Amino acid sequence: HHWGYGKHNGPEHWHKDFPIAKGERQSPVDIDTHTAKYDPSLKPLSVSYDQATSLRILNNGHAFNVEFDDSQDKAVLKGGPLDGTYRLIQFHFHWGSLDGQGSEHTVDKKKYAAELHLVHWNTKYGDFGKAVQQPDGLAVLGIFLKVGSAKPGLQKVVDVLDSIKTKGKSADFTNFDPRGLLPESLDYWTYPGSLTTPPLLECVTWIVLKEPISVSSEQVLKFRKLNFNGEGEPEELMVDNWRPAQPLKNRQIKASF
């Protein structure tokens, strides 16, 4: 009985195998824009994805991951609330069964159709494994997706999804440029949190961009054709793979603008 997003293994059940689900700095959270405070101490955020090198895409039964070669100093996130350099390891999305829901973080309780997570690990810790054992081991850049005009840079991902429909499947996915998934503005909100999926480790500095990117109804509809199940199993569409907002507790959300 593995964790998932269903009635019997969903977010409300995770705390049993992962007690930290009720921890002090869980994610996602609702971003109350009026309570968020502009922080002058934040340095300019730097997203350098020019040398990013993707390797492949995988359906892990929860979402799909576009993984990158993080063996070298390429595709890095720094500045802003971050100290040092964080390296891109993979990105994935969380989406709903309907356009009215799907995002994990919410803005003044507003739910977007989906949310993109670009995961990076603090290079001072050697690698991803050692990083998830640290309070500041990870930095996740979150980007909201709304349904409207198509996002040209996302199509390559959309078109390869047919080959990884079920859990366990992976496919070559080289030369994908994540720069094509970024909105114009880098204005953002930031706060200390956790991974939004088990093991829900609290090693994350969240950086959620204010400006959402637009994707077409057709593009998100293809996300929804994926399966949670493995090949040859009863079909359960991969939708609503998002965790709801958690208690803010002893935390303050800072704005870069």
Ligand SMILES: CCCCCCCCOS(N)(=O)=O
């Ligand atoms: C250490 C086990 C694997 C962690 C997977 C991290 C990706 C999922 O987290 S998220 N949604 O970006 O907060």
Ligand SMILES: [Cl-]
């Ligand atoms: Cl279900």
Ligand SMILES: [Zn+2]
């Ligand atoms: Zn995520």
